[PDB]
A paper describes a structure:
The protein, however, degraded into shorter fragments, the most prominent of which had a molecular mass of 46 kDa. Mass spectrometry analysis of this fragment yielded a sequence coverage that included amino acids at the N and C termini from residue 34 to residue 411. A construct of this core domain (termed “WipA411”) was therefore produced, expressed, purified, and crystallized, yielding crystals diffracting to 1.84 Å resolution. Its structure was determined using the single-wavelength anomalous dispersion method applied to selenomethionine (SeMet)-substituted crystals of WipA411. Residues including nine residues of the N-terminal His tag linker and the protein sequence up to residue 410 were visible in the electron density and were therefore included in the final model. The WipA411 crystals contain one molecule/asymmetric unit (AU) and no metal. The first is between the tip of the α-helical hairpin of one molecule and the globular domain from a symmetry-related molecule and is observed in both the WipA411 and WipA435 structures (and interaction details in B). This interface includes five H-bonds and one salt bridge covering a surface area of ∼550 Å2. Overall, all proteins including the shorter WipA411 elute as dimers.
Numbering used by the authors:
A (entry chain A), B (entry chain A): 24 to 410
Write the structure that this text describes.
Amino acid sequence: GLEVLFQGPGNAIKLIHFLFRHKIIKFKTEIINFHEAYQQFVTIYEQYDDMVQEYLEIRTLLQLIQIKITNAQQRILDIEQKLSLATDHQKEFSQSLLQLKKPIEANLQMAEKSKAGLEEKLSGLKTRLPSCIERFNKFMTQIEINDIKTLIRLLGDEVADRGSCDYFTLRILDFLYQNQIAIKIILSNHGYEFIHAYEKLVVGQPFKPKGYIGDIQIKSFWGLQLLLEQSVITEEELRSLVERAYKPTLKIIDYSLSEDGITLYSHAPIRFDSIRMAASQLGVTYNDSTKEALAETIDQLNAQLQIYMKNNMLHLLFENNEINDPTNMTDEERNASPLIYLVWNRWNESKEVENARPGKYNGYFVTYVHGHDPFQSPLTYVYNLDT
Amino acid sequence: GLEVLFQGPGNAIKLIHFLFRHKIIKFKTEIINFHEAYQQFVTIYEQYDDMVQEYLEIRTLLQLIQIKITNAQQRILDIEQKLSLATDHQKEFSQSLLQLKKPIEANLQMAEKSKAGLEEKLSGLKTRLPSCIERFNKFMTQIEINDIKTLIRLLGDEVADRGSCDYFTLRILDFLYQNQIAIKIILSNHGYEFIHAYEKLVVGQPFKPKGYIGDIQIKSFWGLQLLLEQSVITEEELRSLVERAYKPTLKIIDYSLSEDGITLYSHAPIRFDSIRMAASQLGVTYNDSTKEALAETIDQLNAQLQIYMKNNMLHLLFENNEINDPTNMTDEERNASPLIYLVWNRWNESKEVENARPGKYNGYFVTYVHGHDPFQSPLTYVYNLDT
């Protein structure tokens, strides 16, 4: 079989860049100017990403301003409650209370005006959104599938914004799914953050800002919220997209078998013994005896990921506030939260020790392929994806 | 008239030390051994202060442990809610959930045992308390008033624990009040903290730990809470003590008139123009023309302090989270919260400028007496109390 590696799943331009480069997709021959259409997509994505950024900031500013308003209104009415109870001979006290109110009524006036200005910018954003999505939907009619026989493994970008799972990325993953492309995404810390945020959006009552948030600081949550709020997409539309084209691709760890070896695909560099630790946490009986046994254990890990995910319980696996440095977890911490180690670990010289990552085990070869990590192992059977 | 200066109002030993030294109080001649009775009071106070300290710590530890318990119980029952919904073929998922519960049930067991140990120490504290107060009440029967013709100004200690307003200090202030001693306390930041905490204790429903607290970190609040909880004193008893012997002594600023001058008593060193700023905040018409006018303005400031205090509104005067450094407030900040400046300001070379503190004004001399401050002004008419 033919296979390629990417980081991702986003951002949209990187993913499009990569799909063109490996001849997975191509412009339909009916397009008059390939370069012009390509540049239009870049512009569209840069326009959409700016709008989501502005929306997040406006929304952050409106949350803080409403705090300012509610605190001022409370303090004024508390003072008003006291004035109403004063006596006829406490005339200095009444004047004192008026003095105290005057700056609060000033701040309240100021905050109400800032809010109005922010709601002005927010409504202007919302008139620009539909045509931007309209232009993206047009771009999506201009491409067609090409090579359908190539498997895509997305090992996850190590930084947030560069691999972010915006709405465009989601629509591209659906395009590949509708065209029968085999896609596998190795779940990362950012992948978990995305799923966690998405579950908030598709549960009733529909999410209203604001709000328990908070954050939801990730940009991919905000753009979906913007699209839902402006009726660009429906909750049924979004659930459909995520359940059919994104969730069924997710793996904790992935593999491929050769005649006498196994290749292990992960997001972070990981020790071989991390797999057993994960099987323990997920209730899977760990079998190491043969490469087929190990593959069968991994399939069951991924089957359990789907169960936790279908039950909205991923946070139990991927959130542990007690861990000090998830990138350099202690052995006690590795046992405690194996899945956090799998997506956060960063390698260094101290971890490049014999038996960390054997190249031969229980009679079969082992090969390790993982997303980008600054440390460069000299082991010939370790593959460290570039950025 | 005869007048003396102290910091205070506490702590109890310092205040007792000071009252003996200035012959305000003395042992009754029926006491067989003055030194022995004195040492017993020191022991009693050291015993009581230790008990209040232990109580605060135990109470702080129990608040944190109850957080640990409630969070563990919630996480276990959330998982139990999920187990009850699993299917017959999700057998790895069930085992996974049990695995996840086991460390939480461990922490819950550990936290419940720590709580039991803390409640063990707390009950042992509570058996020692009544006899300690009993021994203090005995000491209070062993002294009598001496010189009744001396006015006591308490300018406030600059640090918390050294001038703290424990129950013993309160009882001593009542003793002086019942014996017709003229007492004036210049309100400090610590004085405000004390009043603020006390208002929590005497309002229904009676304060139950815990609780919105929080803190209430001041020790003087905790010892009163301990005494009330163990029925050593009643809310009516405590309200009586504070309303009759403490609150009527409180001044924002105090004065004394000579034939041609005024002396200004404050807790912190303050600029002369801070008085007008305070009159503005309290609704008092500021008159500066003569020393009698200024005295009359100050009497009205103090009358307004009593109104704010009788209405439980002191926090409006003495809490401003926007101020950056209350010890070095900007002029804009001084205008904003004059009373915060009056109790927090610390002097330095940059503030020792002509016209800051005139020694002659509108035809009368001015003299400044304030609580301890590291900076030592060479002005002959500024008196900086020692520690």
